[model samples]
Target: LSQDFVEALKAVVGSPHVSTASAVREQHGHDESMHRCQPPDAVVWPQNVDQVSRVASLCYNQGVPIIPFGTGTGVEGGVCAVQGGVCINLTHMDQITELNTEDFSVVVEPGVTRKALNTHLRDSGLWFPVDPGADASLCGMAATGASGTNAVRYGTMRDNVINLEVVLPDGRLLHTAGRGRHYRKSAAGYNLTGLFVGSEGTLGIITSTTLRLHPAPEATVAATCAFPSVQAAVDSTVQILQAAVPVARIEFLDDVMMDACNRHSKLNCPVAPTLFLEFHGSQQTLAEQLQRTEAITQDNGGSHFSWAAEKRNELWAARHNAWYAALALSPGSKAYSTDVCVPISRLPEILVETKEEIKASKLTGAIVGHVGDGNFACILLVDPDDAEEQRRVKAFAENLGRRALALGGTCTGEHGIGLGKRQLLQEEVGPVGVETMRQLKNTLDPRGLMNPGKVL
Candidate 1:
């Protein structure tokens, strides 16, 4: 960078904050994604919105890229500094500015992690339920539009975010908040809130977000059901949804994944096709739903179903680490998380077909899913250094994605398009939608500085 660029950054964030130090650059460039690390030119830690604006403007004016780094937990190389510019780490901006329990809304800085907010909410009887498996930054979550096991009940980031304060590419701050004059829906203008929520940092940098929260469940019931086959487990899931159970989380893990869990977590749970279910409601509602779900499981040839709280936690511990476990299934391998969602009616067929593909390929992998939401994933483990293994894993993921599209499903249910699924996006969204998306990208970021090469 020019001497002028260095002076501008130092002016806004100070000498220590505007650093080109190797340690800071390395930390900013590393992401939870398994990509090979490549450090940025510099890292700028801004403490407030004004500081963020000034830092961004310096990069913008200098025609240098500025990539926002939160917890750096994205799995698709979303945080990789491909452009070799400044990394604006958000950790310094960590703060939960407000929490209104009465209105069920909370204002939080992007740097705040889910665990951080949940810890604070423990005594407030309110909870933010977006859990993306990893303890990612809220800013990173919003940037990638993350979702996980709880997504079936609470929806993704796009669903929960009511308002956002975004700093656009040119360092102009824009606020999109409040519903309307009646505090209801907005017929006022374009839903910019939705637009920026999943823009993957291409449109703007999310500074602070006003999120919607739910009251903590007073009565909760958790359970686990085992089935002889993946099909039977999925069959039961469709039936559970049809029964109208207010299940907060329903997850599935095939035996291969279960073995990984047992190995990694050191838990000795039986390895069978399984479903971890949770119901949130009054005792009566919980009982009724469990009874209905039990009947459905019986009809689908499921066995060894347990709904007790003890069984639920034990079983869920396995499912929660399914990816880690699955990754370990193939010794000395890296895990690639790929998810696809099919219509309820097609899940059994899709899952069964996927299982067959894995078997024929003789690959070490585990299949787990949020079955109730028609979403499922295969944790593909590959030895990154082996070209043959890389090709095999890559082929399996592509075939699965193509098959998903054929079955009236999306290649990615919740995982956003990062370096992992850029090609797959074309198959999912097609030419016209993608073309329009590019037009919007160009409009929002004329110089294309904000997290470039992501979701393109």
Candidate 2:
């Protein structure tokens, strides 16, 4: 960069906040992906909305790419500076600016994480329900449209975000909703908030987010049921949902994943297809719900319905740390996390075929899913040094994605179309749909300076 460019950026956020240091640039270059890193020329930290806007203006006018970065927990390489310009790390902007308990809404800067926000809200009897299991920044979650174990009952980030404060490519600060951030519902104009929620920062940078919160459940119970087969386990899941039982969370793990979890966590659980479940309600309602679910489980050949809190926490912790458990199964191996969602009715069929594919390929792959929402993530482990293994891994992931599309599902359920899934996006949304997205990108970011080479 020229002296003028450096001076201008330093003026926007001060010299101390701007860095061209090799370590800082490299640190901001890549996310938690197997993809190769592409370090930015520089990184900048802006303290507030005004500073963010000014820094964006400098980058925009100079035709330099601006990558909006948060915590480096993203697995899809969404934060990578592929084009090598400037990375705007948002971690310094952390702040919980407002909490409106009456409306069950909170206004936060882009840097506030889901865990931190919930910790702050614990005393208020309200909590943010979106948990992607990464402690990811809320704005980053919004950018990726993230969902987690509780999505069955609480919904994903798109459903939880009420509004957004965005700085456009041309440095204009725009509010997604004109009525301010606290409104619960609006039919007034175009839903710009939804437009940018899962956009992956290609059009603009999210400076602040207003999230909708849920009231705490009075009573909670967690349970696990072992099944004779994957079919039986998935069948029970379908029935549980069909019975209109308000299950808070219902997760599935194939035998391979169950084995990994058992070995990694050193638990003596059965190594068969299993369903980990959580229910929330009054004490009476919880018992009734469990009774119905247990009957469903029995009919589908499921047994050992355990609801002990200690066991439940252990099971869930193992589930959330599935990636690490998978790694432990094969030390020094690289793994890729890929997800796809199908209709509830098609999940079993897709899952059965996918498991067969894994067996046929003779690869180290494990299956885990948010079964209640029909979304599943597969961790495909590969020997990093073996080119043939890497090739097979990509082929398996592509095959799974295509199969999901054929079964009337999306290429991705929660993870966005970052570097790894761009081709899948084209396959899912054909030429016409993709063209429309390109049009929107061109309209908002004609120069293509905002997080260039992503989601388009």
Candidate 3:
């Protein structure tokens, strides 16, 4: 935060890796969200854990905040440095250290990305399947507990991570699970690994991660079906599971999203409520799943099916690009994507209610989600020049969170609560629960410098 602090950081990571340049700080301040920029005092690129610890220790000693920046792909403003301090960018620490195909596990550094790891495993017949759309940092994904469309079959970051090497707020190295321990299951002392999984960088900086991988499927099939109504699309998803279909992915995009995708991705997808589904299994099982799912969709008024492999890839790619496509719907506007997950049985009711709410508010937004897991996101666009519209957008965003809570759902299914959802988090977790969290934070970071002003 001062000339002295900048010099100290430069000494630790070298001057080239440290920057007080306004452009650099501004770039590291926020992720792909509508949150206003809160740039840190400086940014540093630490190549290894030792450098990370040294930088963190320096900040802690001076009562300066420390924010961790990964791929900046998060929608919740996870990397914002609300309290000006040092922002540690971890992209230079990239490395895929270990790969155990037989055991279905791998060790990775903070800079390694999900796509990078999968590509490394291409010829190994194994893959890390947590595809969170963006090719975000693997350790960063573990930090936010991210899940993608593949979560229906592969699970979230929490389920896939085996261990972590964390640099505590005070720069002390702490291994959540014992060093180099990658056992598939353990009656471990405490679930310390899970504790840090979604801490959102408040607890400490993640240096490395050990992840569980899955064998690539023998036969894979992707399909897109147009539904007459949101209810019909959601119903088809629920029934697919009830019918014992081992679906790899099931995503829903409302008509608005479909139209946006058509324009943004340059494809001719049907401009209607649609369900993009994928199945993974052996040949016999794959065929059976396709038949059952097609029949279920047909009974629910689903039509215009596209199941050819090439067309399916195009559809999935568009699904991966949904966020950008949604943004394209309103030029010169910003968006805030708020997401939540409810009970499978309640998905239809809440989604329908949200659709109605979006229309009633007269706001431009789109509905999309990993419907198989009952999680959905509403990307509400706002005009920068209109303050009144901004307030309405915020109100709508908060309303959606509360509505999900009312229906036995979480405020966030994968995206962790950052600056915008702090109040909603307290409302989700009561006074006692929140204070308990504060106690843990107080014990670990008494100086309050670790990703200050985030998640309590």
Candidate 4:
């Protein structure tokens, strides 16, 4: 970079906030995924939306790529600076900009994380429920169109985000919805907000996100039920949904994952295919939901139906820390978290096929899923320096992706295509669809300077 570029970045925010330091660039470049690190040339911390726009404008004029960094918890290598340029670290802009209790809406900056926002909204009679396990930035979640265990009930970021404040490639500020307008529905024009939700930072930088909130449930119940086999567990899931139980969450962990979680957490829980369940409603609704679910569990040969009250949180400790537990299973290995969603009827068949594949490949991996929505993930651990292991893992990934595609499901469930899955994206969306996407990308970012070499 020219001395002029560095100085201009310093001028936009401050000299202290701009850094070309190696460690800072390294931290800004990589995330918590297994992807290799390629640090940015420089990193800039913008204090506000205007600062973001100014820094972006400078990068645009310089024809330098811009990669937005948030909590660095993304698993898709979304923040990797494949073409080293200016990285805009957004952690300094943490703020819950607005809360409209009556409207069930809250506005937040890119740096406000999911847990922090929930902590702030503790007593507001409402909460944001799109949790992807990691404490990822709210705007980053919107950027990736993230979802989690609660996604089965509350919906993904796409459904919850009401509007967005975006900084276009050329420093122009855009509000997906009209300025200051919070109406729930409109039919005036195109839904640009939806277009940006899952853009993966290839289009523009998200400055602020307005999210829809849900009311706190009057009553809550959580349970853990062990199944004789994966088939039994998944069948129970299908039956539970068919029974219209309105379950708030229904996550599945295979016997291997259950054992790993037990070992990692030092608990004596049964090692069997399991369904961790939760329900939200009034006491009367809870009574009906629990009984119906219990009958379904028994019908499918599930046992150890344990109910948890205040210990609901304790029961969830394993599911939330699955990534870490998987790492602990292989002390010196890193995990590649990949997910895919399939139709309900094919869930059991695909899972059985994957289990066989893992067994045949003789790899270190565990299966866990949000079965209610037919989205499951495999945590495959690999040694970074082992070339043979890399080949086997890469082959496993391609095979799994092709399996999902054959089942008429998406290649990715929540984790977006960052450095991975470009070919899969092309296969999922036909050539014409991909061409249309490229047309949009070229029109918006003609220079290809916005997180280049990603998505399209």
Candidate 5:
């Protein structure tokens, strides 16, 4: 950053809040992704929306790149400072400003983490069910239109999000939602809510959000099933859908992943393909659902079905910890996580082929998925210091993405097109979609100062 730009940013966020410290710059430069890191020129923590606008306006005037950063949990390097100017860390804006139980909604700042939100709502008998494994910031989650294990029932962030309070690239604040005076679906005007939901921060800076919530399920019962092979496990998962069981979640973990979990948790279980399932409903209803699901599993060669909350929690917790387990696979190895989704009918074949592809690469990896949603991930462990290995791993990851596209899926299911997958986006969304995205970026940040070189 130039001296003038730094001074202007300090004025906007206060000199004490604007940082040139190497540690802060480096930390805000990248996310959990395994891409090349590009540290920002500077980092600033704004106190409010007005302050955020001030910083953005200053950057716009100076023709400097500015990236909005939340919890830095996005898997596609969405928070990376590729153009290297100012990284406006939004963590300081964490706040829960409103709660309306009757409307089943709440107002929160962009930096509020999902875990924090659930902790506060524990006693309200209400819950926000967008669980992306990583306790991502509400704003960041919205950026990618994220979903997770519970998406089979509660839906993803896109479904639960009603409206957002955003700071445009020109430093103006605007709010949208079906609340206050207006209560209706979109019409006439452009659908800004839908536009910004998965925009990945190229459109505007999300300041606050009006999130839709749901009544907590009356009963939560989780179960696990074991199969001799991955095909058997996936077949059982498909059976649940075919039988029309209203299951809350159905997650799949292959043998490699199961072994990782067993070692991590210090538990003994047969290392084989497994499905972690959950049902949320009345006790009586859940009982019937479990019985039917169990019967289906048995017909599909599922030899083990364990239904217990304690066991379920342990299983889901392990599934959530799959990322950590993948990281643990190689101990000191740096890793890259690839997420892709396919049509429900193609999930089983895709996963089987993906495993074969990984095995052919002679690399250590694990496959885990929100099976009910047909979304799965493969963690690629590589030695970062070895440039050749990094290049090889990148090629392998790209191949996986290409395979997903061939199977009628997206390159990124939940992870946005940050630095990691920018080149693949055109192929994934087609030239028209990519051109439209460019036009939107130009309209929002005409100077090309907001998150420059990302997602386009």
Candidate 6:
């Protein structure tokens, strides 16, 4: 049966594009998560929409699972083939099909990375701003509804992705908006585009996306502020948001993360709980914004408030590499990175309690957050070989998830409900919500053949 499935894949995507090689299957088996790899029966690379549809149709008829693979940067097991079938490696489908400069929108294939798209748009006086730190494929970002530091002001993948070209389970090509990619607003009917944006490939495979773009800021500045304690840092963040500060980004790092960044990124930043911020506007406006933010920080016992217009990359590089820096804190230890989001009013309390929990538990955890939006992440390091230690760390993560739920927050803020959070999904959304989701999944994929065991 496996051999026949491989032959059918080859027939759809060509022999050269289909592979039963162990190495290829292994490579497509997992993502960046700590989950064990589950190799697929075979892998296929469909280079065009028609080929993708043909493969989907073949797999649909065969009752074989179709797992879509992007850049494999997902921290959750969204791309993993848990039940084992055909893994569709869509990296070869990369293409920037359209650039509507006048409308500030661009159309791109599933494999176009954030960095690649921005590089292509550099000379156009516009840029795509929904960056999830890594140079993740745009389609993958949309699939996960990924949001990062810039998400506080610019919004997330859900907001920037205007339309999607999705290949449904039955090999039907769907333009979410139906009319095309140009319509910016539609009150005509239910939002089908939203249905699949963060579906994690359970409903369909995103072949291409129409993205909303923003004009380059006239002036930009980056700043860092150190607070006496985590509470102070979080308080300052709350005040800044309440003040309606037009901050492009406001990221938080606890003292542990600060120490890690200071060591790994080779910077002299103070080893204190800190806030890394950025502002965008005209020169005069940014200056005033910075001044106002400094005042708010000082009021909350924040110190070392410094701003820089040049070398902004240096400041954000430390923020972007926070996960790696955290890994460097305890060499050879595997990391379990997780996140939770709460209302801004509840952020300080939840964060403070979470910090105390880690400290009391003596877990080697580092904290980082897009604080402006009340979402925070923790990089918990543990010995991969120590089963007991793994159990403790997993418990700590679950406790945090439950705490977030108790505080009126989500089990996950940005990362979708992949295999790692399957149980948490039930806890977060009640039985009725889960039932509705399962119904939607059944309606779209009756055989449960699309990216099985993810999201749903």
Point out where model 1 deviates above 4 Å: 178-184, 308-318, 330-332
Which residues of candidate 4, in runs, are more than 4 Å off? Answer: none
RMSD of each: 2.1, 1.5, 1.1, 1.1, 1.7, 1.3
Clash tally for model 1: 0
For residues 1-456, write the lDDT of model 1, one tens digit per residue. Answer: 767787788989888888887887888786755666778898888889899898888788778998888887776777788888988887888899668888788878977888899998988999999887777788778877778788888888888887888888888988866422112257777877888887777788889888888888879887777788988988888878877776899988888877778788766656888887888888888788778888898999887566555665666656666766776666677767778888888988998888888888867678989887788888888777878877778788888988888988988877677778888888788899899999999998898898888889
What digit string (tens of lDDT, one per residue) describes model 6 on residues 204-307? 99999999999999988888899889999999999999999989999999999999988987777888999999999998999899989999999998885776
Q: Pairing residues by index, what is the TM-score of model 1?
A: 0.94
| Local accuracy of candidate 4 as per-residue lDDT tens digits, 1-456 | 788899999999999999999999998888888889989999999999999999999999889999988888888788999999999888899999679989999999988998999999998889999988788899999988899899888999998999999998888999999666677788979999998998888899999999999999998888899988888999999888888779999999998899988887665569998999999999999999988999999999999578884477776776888888888888988778668888888898888888878888778789999889888988899898987887788778877888898999998888898887888889998999999999989887888998898887
TM-score, model 2 to reference: 0.97
The residue-by-residue lDDT of candidate 3 on 1-456, one tens digit each, is 678878888888998999989998999998988888889988899978999999999989889899988899888887888888889999899999878888899999988998889888888999998888888999999999999999999999999999999999989999899898898888869889999999989999999999999988998888789988889998888888788788999999999999999998777878899998888999999888888888999999999578756777787788999998988888888888888899999998999988988888778889999988889999898787788988899999898899898988889999888888888889888899899999999988998999988887
Question: lDDT score of model 1?
Answer: 0.81
Cα RMSD, model 4:
1.1
Go through the candidates in order and give each one's C-alpha lDDT: 0.81, 0.88, 0.89, 0.88, 0.83, 0.88
* Model 5 clashing residue pairs (backbone): none
lDDT of 2 by residue, 1-456 (tens): 777898899989999999999999999888877766889989999999899999998999899999999897888888888998889998789999778999999988878998889989978999998878677889989988999999999999998999899999989999898536568788987899999988888989999999999999998888888998888999898889989899999999989898998988866678898898999999999999999999999999999687656776787778888877887889987788889999999988988888788888878789999989988988998787888888888888998999999999998899888888999999998999999999999999999999998887
Model 3 lDDT, residue 5, Cα: 77
CA error at residue 40 for candidate 2, angstroms: 1.3
lDDT per residue (tens digit) for residues 1-456 in model 5: 678778888888899999989988888888888766789989899999899989888877777788889888887778788888888888899998678877788888877988889898989998888898887889888878888888888888788787888888889877755334223356747767878888788888988877888888888887778888888888788878878899999988888998998887664457888888889899899889989998999998987677665676677777788888878878887788788888878888888888888788867789888878778888888887888888888888898889889989888777778878887788988889888888988888898888877788
Worst 10 residues of 2 by lDDT: 304-313
Q: How much is 162 displaced in model 3, in angstroms? A: 0.3
List the lowest-lDDT window of 10 residues for candidate 1. 176-185
Q: Write down the TM-score of every candidate.
A: 0.94, 0.97, 0.98, 0.98, 0.96, 0.98
